[PDB]
């Protein structure tokens, strides 16, 4: 029996697809049982607007680190709402320089996240799997958003240690397919976009699990 | 690998124990694994304020019907918020019938969702298990609250068909220990209360599954 | 010194205006000190996607009901995210009949809310103020959303007991002014829309506070 | 009516005490009212993962500068998440300098935001009050964590100019009682810890305001 532990923000919750409609987490689970030919047990820890610094603190909670210790695959979303609130400050004040440090403060919390996972798993374990999803651009017309999200994904890929730690290219999934993959709120993906996300996670492979 | 689906309101969510702290559904999942020596996959469809009629309407959702059909164990919570609404309506109108009519709707929806669960599974799989929890009285000093909830619970026990279908006596778990088993809002359970609820579920046995 | 206690969901938080940019709560506070010519102390209890059933439970928390007992003005937002998730289920399944009971289950939680406020305030108090904001339509093109939101506001106005309890016509504030008052997410209001909201709350008057 | 503004990270938010449960800033507000016999208006600008450089950049925001200029009491928290990031970086690289460089940036930003607060108010109003809290050691069994935080605290005490500016010894409050003063995540305080923090602030006095 495989163990999938999913963490993140409004994307891991499934916001945009509707209440109880399967998001990317549930669909990536289905593609796991089909590929690896084994039943997988899922558990989710997510909240809209959940910060990355909070996740690094959560991993000390006994019930959470228990799920991480036995987790065969781990997915992490985050920082999507940090750039949104930053753009909204730019939308009101028209200043390109805002106190956002999404690239600076989120990326450093990510590397500390991965290290805490390593401590819980134990250095002897080489079998587990971690998959970080970068950010898509929901506002292609706004050039400043495309500059911020591209800069965050450029610095996020540096944390990849294939094939255990892989950064999923969520940006390329949504590039040129915004209106088809986004919900009516246009900031969270549709049920179609969550399906394409799960396919990109499947494209990353499963390392030594096979 | 066993599949355990859980439906209901804030209790199935785990409100009161703290964010990401395990509620009763995952403490019951761990004990289920311990008592049957088999890993368990958990799926949860729950939201605060989800009344019993909505929970019945969920069973026609294609994705929810998928997880209910595969479920070896099903837990259902509900009608707790109707008591809070009725106590506030009684405070203004002093009509003792307002809750009996609302309690009559819950008992009808419980019987409705029960009839749909067997319509979903059919006659081949009678090995399924349903454990629905009755209502506890969070206000023991209010006799009308105790009388109202006691009447709903004796009418709810009519639905029991042991060992396949069992009605969990949540009222007996909480009676006398509302100070330590309820959370800060005096209506939702604490981690102690959720732990005691999961103990009552494990005590009910597992029927044909063991 | 006046006391303003604000409750609600993502609107009371100020989502859409940016991080720390003043939403309608902060701007309605400013217009209170200008009109009533007295300093007002503000305290907020809000969370994105916060259910109305949770608010009715929150009012039993000792720290919350203390702020309500001394509150001169009280604002309540809610249920805006319940219709959003319902439309999103309709967007995927194309069924007009969904398990949403926003009009049915949210409105009944509202009347129980107002009664609990009355119990905390005491029946002798006639001076306090409560202001409920109805829902605006962020999707004017979608006709089903305009039908649902209009039906919710029609049943919500029935709870008005002027001038203590007033239902703010948030719908008319945004009607014909969507792109100007909405944030880039198009589901939460811009800093302009939060300003117009505060002006509508000011239009409701202040009852006996004057 | 006194105006009390509060800036910082998750501590100023109140993370760990439970949702909507009072953190240290509102327990300190109640004691401030009790010790000075005057109502207090509270404004809070805080978010999880808000590092010290961002808090300094906030002081140029027009709305934040408004509340800081009117503030009779200002509390600042920060640099707590840098310790968590540094401990994870040290776990991989074993460089003892990684935190001293990060601790040097916090002490610089604290001095920076202090210099801006007087630039915001000027020379007319020297009756303002600033209480900044140092870091506690949530991991007492790690000597490197205790040594790192002790060094940051003695360098932080250089900024004290009593009674106007005071550095609150949060370390002494938590030392020896990390089991009961920390929350479930072993890093954020509990309601007991937040209560003890507010007691330490009231013990510091109020300078020229009393
Ligand atoms: Cl298997
Ligand atoms: Cl509920
Ligand atoms: Cl005054
Ligand atoms: Cl933080």
Coordinates of N, CA, C and O in Angstrom, one line a residue, chain C residues 60-168:
Chain C
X60 N -20.0 31.8 21.0 CA -19.9 31.2 22.3 C -18.5 31.3 22.9 O -18.3 31.1 24.1
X61 N -17.5 31.7 22.1 CA -16.2 31.8 22.6 C -16.1 33.0 23.5 O -16.6 34.1 23.1
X62 N -15.5 32.9 24.7 CA -15.6 34.0 25.6 C -15.0 35.3 25.1 O -15.5 36.4 25.4
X63 N -13.8 35.2 24.5 CA -13.2 36.5 24.0 C -14.0 37.1 22.9 O -14.1 38.4 22.8
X64 N -14.7 36.3 22.1 CA -15.5 36.9 21.0 C -16.8 37.5 21.5 O -17.1 38.7 21.1
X65 N -17.5 36.9 22.4 CA -18.7 37.4 22.9 C -18.5 38.6 23.8 O -19.4 39.4 24.0
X66 N -17.3 38.7 24.3 CA -16.9 40.0 25.0 C -16.9 41.2 24.1 O -17.4 42.2 24.4
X67 N -16.2 41.0 22.9 CA -16.2 42.1 22.0 C -17.6 42.4 21.4 O -17.9 43.5 21.1
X68 N -18.4 41.4 21.3 CA -19.8 41.6 20.8 C -20.6 42.3 21.8 O -21.4 43.3 21.5
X69 N -20.5 42.0 23.1 CA -21.3 42.6 24.2 C -21.0 44.1 24.3 O -22.0 44.9 24.5
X70 N -19.8 44.6 24.1 CA -19.5 46.0 24.1 C -19.5 46.6 22.7 O -19.2 47.8 22.6
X71 N -19.8 45.9 21.7 CA -19.7 46.4 20.3 C -20.8 47.4 20.1 O -22.0 47.1 20.3
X72 N -20.5 48.6 19.6 CA -21.5 49.6 19.2 C -22.0 49.3 17.9 O -23.2 49.5 17.6
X73 N -21.2 48.9 16.9 CA -21.6 48.6 15.6 C -21.0 47.2 15.3 O -19.9 46.9 15.7
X74 N -21.8 46.4 14.5 CA -21.3 45.0 14.1 C -21.6 44.9 12.6 O -22.8 45.1 12.2
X75 N -20.6 44.4 11.9 CA -20.8 44.1 10.5 C -20.6 42.6 10.2 O -19.7 42.0 10.9
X76 N -21.4 42.1 9.3 CA -21.3 40.6 9.0 C -21.3 40.4 7.5 O -22.3 40.8 6.9
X77 N -20.3 39.8 7.0 CA -20.3 39.3 5.6 C -20.3 37.8 5.7 O -20.0 37.2 6.7
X78 N -20.7 37.2 4.6 CA -20.7 35.7 4.5 C -21.4 35.2 3.3 O -22.2 36.0 2.7
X79 N -21.3 33.9 3.1 CA -21.9 33.1 2.1 C -21.5 33.5 0.7 O -22.0 32.9 -0.3
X80 N -20.6 34.5 0.5 CA -20.1 34.8 -0.8 C -19.4 33.6 -1.5 O -19.5 33.4 -2.7
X81 N -18.7 32.8 -0.7 CA -17.9 31.7 -1.2 C -18.8 30.5 -1.4 O -18.4 29.5 -2.1
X82 N -20.0 30.4 -0.8 CA -20.9 29.3 -0.9 C -21.5 29.2 -2.3 O -21.6 28.1 -2.9
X83 N -21.9 30.4 -2.9 CA -22.4 30.4 -4.2 C -21.3 30.2 -5.3 O -21.6 29.7 -6.3
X84 N -20.1 30.7 -4.9 CA -19.0 30.5 -5.9 C -18.7 29.1 -6.1 O -18.6 28.6 -7.2
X85 N -18.6 28.3 -5.0 CA -18.3 26.9 -5.1 C -19.5 26.1 -5.8 O -19.3 25.1 -6.4
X86 N -20.7 26.7 -5.6 CA -21.9 26.0 -6.2 C -21.9 26.3 -7.7 O -22.1 25.3 -8.5
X87 N -21.6 27.5 -8.2 CA -21.4 27.8 -9.6 C -20.3 26.9 -10.2 O -20.5 26.4 -11.3
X88 N -19.2 26.7 -9.5 CA -18.1 25.9 -10.0 C -18.5 24.5 -10.2 O -18.0 23.8 -11.1
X89 N -19.4 23.9 -9.4 CA -19.9 22.6 -9.6 C -20.8 22.6 -10.8 O -20.8 21.6 -11.6
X90 N -21.6 23.7 -11.0 CA -22.4 23.8 -12.2 C -21.5 24.0 -13.4 O -21.9 23.5 -14.5
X91 N -20.4 24.6 -13.3 CA -19.5 24.8 -14.4 C -18.9 23.5 -14.9 O -18.6 23.4 -16.1
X92 N -18.8 22.6 -14.1 CA -18.2 21.3 -14.5 C -19.2 20.3 -14.9 O -19.0 19.5 -15.9
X93 N -20.4 20.2 -14.2 CA -21.4 19.2 -14.5 C -22.6 19.7 -15.3 O -23.4 18.9 -15.7
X94 N -22.7 21.1 -15.5 CA -23.7 21.7 -16.3 C -25.2 21.4 -15.8 O -26.1 21.4 -16.6
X95 N -25.3 21.0 -14.6 CA -26.6 20.8 -13.9 C -27.0 22.0 -13.2 O -26.2 22.5 -12.3
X96 N -28.2 22.5 -13.4 CA -28.7 23.7 -12.7 C -29.1 23.3 -11.2 O -29.0 24.1 -10.3
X97 N -29.4 22.0 -11.0 CA -29.8 21.6 -9.7 C -28.5 21.0 -9.0 O -28.0 20.0 -9.4
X98 N -28.0 21.7 -8.0 CA -26.8 21.3 -7.3 C -27.2 21.3 -5.8 O -28.2 21.9 -5.4
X99 N -26.4 20.6 -5.0 CA -26.8 20.5 -3.6 C -26.6 21.8 -2.8 O -26.6 21.8 -1.6
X100 N -26.4 23.0 -3.5 CA -26.3 24.2 -2.8 C -27.6 24.5 -2.0 O -28.7 24.4 -2.6
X101 N -27.5 25.0 -0.8 CA -28.6 25.5 -0.1 C -28.2 26.9 0.5 O -28.5 27.1 1.7
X102 N -27.5 27.7 -0.2 CA -27.1 29.0 0.3 C -28.3 29.8 0.8 O -28.2 30.3 1.9
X103 N -29.3 30.0 0.0 CA -30.5 30.7 0.5 C -31.1 30.0 1.7 O -31.5 30.6 2.7
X104 N -31.1 28.6 1.7 CA -31.8 27.9 2.7 C -31.0 27.8 4.0 O -31.6 28.0 5.1
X105 N -29.8 27.4 3.9 CA -29.0 27.1 5.1 C -28.2 28.3 5.6 O -27.9 28.4 6.8
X106 N -27.8 29.3 4.8 CA -27.1 30.5 5.2 C -28.1 31.5 5.9 O -27.7 32.0 6.9
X107 N -29.2 31.6 5.3 CA -30.2 32.6 5.9 C -30.7 32.2 7.2 O -30.9 33.1 8.1
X108 N -30.9 30.9 7.5 CA -31.3 30.5 8.8 C -30.2 30.6 9.8 O -30.5 30.8 11.0
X109 N -28.9 30.4 9.4 CA -27.8 30.7 10.3 C -27.7 32.2 10.6 O -27.3 32.6 11.7
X110 N -28.2 33.1 9.7 CA -28.1 34.5 10.0 C -29.1 34.9 11.0 O -28.8 35.7 11.9
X111 N -30.3 34.4 11.0 CA -31.3 34.7 12.0 C -30.9 34.2 13.4 O -31.2 34.9 14.4
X112 N -30.3 33.0 13.4 CA -29.8 32.5 14.7 C -28.6 33.3 15.2 O -28.4 33.5 16.4
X113 N -27.8 33.9 14.3 CA -26.7 34.8 14.6 C -27.3 36.0 15.3 O -26.8 36.3 16.4
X114 N -28.2 36.7 14.7 CA -28.8 37.9 15.3 C -29.4 37.7 16.6 O -29.4 38.5 17.5
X115 N -30.0 36.5 16.8 CA -30.6 36.2 18.1 C -29.6 36.0 19.2 O -29.7 36.4 20.3
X116 N -28.4 35.3 18.9 CA -27.4 35.1 19.8 C -26.7 36.5 20.2 O -26.4 36.7 21.4
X117 N -26.6 37.4 19.2 CA -26.2 38.7 19.5 C -27.1 39.4 20.5 O -26.7 40.1 21.4
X118 N -28.4 39.2 20.3 CA -29.4 39.8 21.2 C -29.3 39.2 22.6 O -29.4 39.9 23.6
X119 N -29.0 37.9 22.7 CA -28.8 37.3 24.1 C -27.6 37.9 24.8 O -27.6 38.1 26.0
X120 N -26.5 38.0 24.0 CA -25.3 38.6 24.6 C -25.4 40.0 25.0 O -25.1 40.4 26.1
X121 N -26.0 40.8 24.1 CA -26.2 42.2 24.4 C -27.2 42.4 25.5 O -27.1 43.4 26.3
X122 N -28.2 41.5 25.7 CA -29.2 41.7 26.7 C -30.4 42.4 26.0 O -30.2 43.3 25.2
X123 N -31.6 42.0 26.3 CA -32.8 42.5 25.7 C -33.0 44.0 26.1 O -33.7 44.7 25.3
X124 N -32.5 44.5 27.2 CA -32.6 45.9 27.6 C -31.9 46.8 26.6 O -32.3 48.0 26.5
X125 N -30.8 46.3 26.0 CA -30.0 47.2 25.1 C -30.8 47.4 23.8 O -31.1 46.5 23.1
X126 N -31.0 48.7 23.4 CA -31.6 49.1 22.1 C -30.7 49.9 21.3 O -31.0 50.4 20.2
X127 N -29.4 50.2 21.8 CA -28.5 51.1 21.2 C -27.6 50.5 20.2 O -27.1 51.3 19.3
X128 N -27.3 49.2 20.2 CA -26.3 48.7 19.4 C -26.7 48.6 17.9 O -27.9 48.8 17.6
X129 N -25.8 48.3 17.1 CA -26.0 48.4 15.6 C -25.4 47.1 14.9 O -24.3 46.7 15.3
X130 N -26.2 46.6 14.0 CA -25.8 45.4 13.2 C -26.1 45.7 11.8 O -27.1 46.2 11.4
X131 N -25.1 45.4 10.9 CA -25.2 45.7 9.5 C -24.7 44.4 8.7 O -23.6 44.1 8.7
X132 N -25.7 43.8 8.0 CA -25.4 42.6 7.2 C -25.2 43.1 5.7 O -26.1 43.8 5.2
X133 N -24.2 42.7 5.1 CA -24.0 43.0 3.6 C -24.4 41.8 2.8 O -24.0 40.6 3.0
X134 N -25.3 42.0 1.8 CA -25.7 41.0 0.9 C -24.6 40.8 -0.1 O -23.5 41.3 0.0
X135 N -25.0 40.0 -1.2 CA -24.0 39.6 -2.1 C -24.1 40.4 -3.4 O -25.2 40.7 -3.9
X136 N -23.0 40.8 -4.0 CA -22.9 41.3 -5.3 C -22.7 40.2 -6.3 O -22.3 39.1 -6.0
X137 N -23.0 40.5 -7.6 CA -22.8 39.6 -8.7 C -21.5 39.9 -9.4 O -21.5 40.8 -10.2
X138 N -20.4 39.1 -9.3 CA -19.2 39.3 -10.0 C -19.2 38.8 -11.4 O -18.4 39.1 -12.2
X139 N -20.2 38.0 -11.8 CA -20.4 37.4 -13.1 C -21.7 37.8 -13.7 O -22.7 37.1 -13.7
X140 N -21.8 39.1 -14.2 CA -23.1 39.5 -14.8 C -23.5 38.7 -16.0 O -24.6 38.6 -16.3
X141 N -22.5 38.2 -16.8 CA -22.8 37.5 -18.0 C -23.5 36.1 -17.7 O -24.4 35.7 -18.4
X142 N -23.1 35.5 -16.6 CA -23.7 34.2 -16.2 C -25.1 34.5 -15.6 O -25.2 35.1 -14.6
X143 N -26.1 34.0 -16.3 CA -27.5 34.4 -15.8 C -27.9 33.6 -14.6 O -28.6 34.1 -13.7
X144 N -27.4 32.4 -14.4 CA -27.7 31.6 -13.2 C -27.1 32.2 -12.0 O -27.8 32.1 -10.9
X145 N -26.0 32.8 -12.0 CA -25.4 33.5 -10.9 C -26.3 34.7 -10.5 O -26.5 35.0 -9.3
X146 N -26.8 35.4 -11.5 CA -27.6 36.6 -11.2 C -29.0 36.1 -10.6 O -29.6 36.9 -9.9
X147 N -29.4 34.9 -11.0 CA -30.7 34.4 -10.4 C -30.5 34.0 -8.9 O -31.3 34.2 -8.1
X148 N -29.3 33.3 -8.6 CA -29.1 32.9 -7.3 C -28.8 34.0 -6.3 O -29.4 34.1 -5.2
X149 N -28.0 35.0 -6.7 CA -27.6 36.1 -5.8 C -28.8 37.0 -5.6 O -29.0 37.5 -4.5
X150 N -29.7 37.2 -6.6 CA -30.9 38.0 -6.4 C -31.9 37.3 -5.5 O -32.5 37.9 -4.6
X151 N -32.0 36.0 -5.6 CA -32.9 35.2 -4.7 C -32.4 35.2 -3.2 O -33.2 35.2 -2.3
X152 N -31.0 35.2 -3.0 CA -30.5 35.3 -1.7 C -30.7 36.6 -1.1 O -31.1 36.7 0.1
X153 N -30.5 37.7 -1.8 CA -30.7 39.0 -1.3 C -32.2 39.3 -1.0 O -32.5 40.1 -0.1
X154 N -33.1 38.7 -1.8 CA -34.5 38.9 -1.6 C -35.0 38.3 -0.2 O -35.8 38.8 0.5
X155 N -34.4 37.1 0.1 CA -34.7 36.5 1.4 C -33.9 37.0 2.5 O -34.3 36.9 3.7
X156 N -32.8 37.7 2.2 CA -32.0 38.3 3.3 C -32.6 39.5 3.9 O -32.5 39.8 5.1
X157 N -33.2 40.4 3.0 CA -33.8 41.6 3.4 C -34.9 41.4 4.4 O -35.2 42.3 5.2
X158 N -35.5 40.2 4.5 CA -36.6 39.9 5.4 C -36.1 39.9 6.9 O -36.9 40.1 7.8
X159 N -34.8 39.8 7.1 CA -34.2 39.8 8.4 C -34.0 41.2 8.9 O -33.5 41.4 10.1
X160 N -34.3 42.2 8.2 CA -34.0 43.6 8.6 C -35.0 44.1 9.6 O -36.2 43.9 9.5
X161 N -34.5 44.7 10.7 CA -35.3 45.3 11.7 C -34.7 46.7 11.9 O -34.0 47.0 12.9
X162 N -35.1 47.6 11.0 CA -34.5 49.0 11.0 C -34.8 49.7 12.3 O -35.9 49.5 12.9
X163 N -33.9 50.6 12.8 CA -32.6 50.9 12.2 C -31.5 50.1 12.9 O -30.3 50.3 12.5
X164 N -31.8 49.3 13.8 CA -30.7 48.5 14.5 C -30.1 47.5 13.5 O -28.9 47.5 13.2
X165 N -31.0 46.6 13.0 CA -30.6 45.6 12.0 C -30.9 46.1 10.6 O -32.1 46.2 10.3
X166 N -29.9 46.3 9.8 CA -30.1 46.7 8.4 C -29.3 45.8 7.5 O -28.2 45.4 7.8
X167 N -29.9 45.5 6.3 CA -29.2 44.7 5.3 C -28.7 45.7 4.2 O -29.5 46.4 3.6
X168 N -27.4 45.7 4.1 CA -26.8 46.6 3.2 C -26.9 46.1 1.7 O -26.7 44.9 1.5

